[PDB]
């Protein structure tokens, strides 16, 4: 994978390029306001040491910060997501992998043409790297998910339980 980051909008002021996560970007970069990945496929973080917000992004050009949907110029941590050639995760309805629980090997736009909860409060993943989003058609905030256990909602990082649709990630 490769990303190269730039302080400034459309590809300008000083920038870094990064073949693997990176922890603590602020040495190299005091904000980050366009992104160009040229392989692989990327999780940017708000704060260090991936914290904060979340963002996906994918092979392709982002001239400003909103076209990755990021809300700001703070882009601190990232991390390289691996590939998978399958992938499995299961959903549950509540904590520790109990109530109605459901599966998913694609991806799913809406889930709750699915599933009938708009909440979902402990996951597994057993194959491959997905990201978890807030609200159907993968909008809202964006959580990453990587092959293991997630047992509550806080284990991705979230501060709530909704999750309206997942993406496998692939190259």
């Known amino acids: 994978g490769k990303i190269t980051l730039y302080e400034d909008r459309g590809f300008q ?3 870094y390029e990064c073949s693997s996560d990176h922890p ?3 040495p190299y970069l005091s904000r980050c ?3 160009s990945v040229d392989s692989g496929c ?3 973080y708000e704060q260090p040491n991936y914290s904060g917000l979340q963002y996906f992004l994918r092979r392709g050009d982002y001239a400003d910060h909103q ?5 700001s110029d703070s882009v601190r941590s990232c991390r390289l997501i691996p590939h998978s050639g399958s992938h499995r995760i299961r959903l549950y309805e509540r904590e520790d992998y109990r ?8 991806d799913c736009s809406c889930l709750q043409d699915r599933f009938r909860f708009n909440e979902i409060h402990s996951l597994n993943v057993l194959e491959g790297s997905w990201v978890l989003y807030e609200l159907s058609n993968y909008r809202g905030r964006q959580y990453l998910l990587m092959p293991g256990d997630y047992r509550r909602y806080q284990d991705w990082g979230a501060t709530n339980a909704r999750v309206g ?3 496998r990630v692939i190259d």
């Open 13 to 15: 002021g000083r920038h």
């Open 24 to 26: 603590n970007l602020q």
């Open 33 to 35: 306001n366009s992104a």
């Open 42 to 44: 990327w999780m940017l």
């Open 67 to 71: 076209q990755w949907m990021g809300l």
């Open 99 to 106: 109530g109605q629980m459901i599966e998913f090997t694609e």
């Open 165 to 167: 649709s997942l993406r």
